[PDB]
């Protein structure tokens, strides 16, 4: 944020992220989105 710096809304929602998100995304980008999901989502669980 160096003296405000113009730039389009078109990148990811993420506060440490300057990649291109996307819609279908969340907004967010594949990366960001992938790991969102919950660490250990497998098929078995006790
Ligand atoms: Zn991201």
């Given at each position: ?23 279908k ?22």
């Amino acid at each position: 944020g160096s003296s405000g710096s113009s730039g389009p809304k078109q990148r990811c929602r993420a506060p440490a992220c300057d990649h291109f998100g996307n819609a279908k995304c969340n907004g967010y980008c594949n990366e960001c989105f992938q790991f969102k999901q919950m660490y250990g989502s497998g098929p078995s669980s006790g």
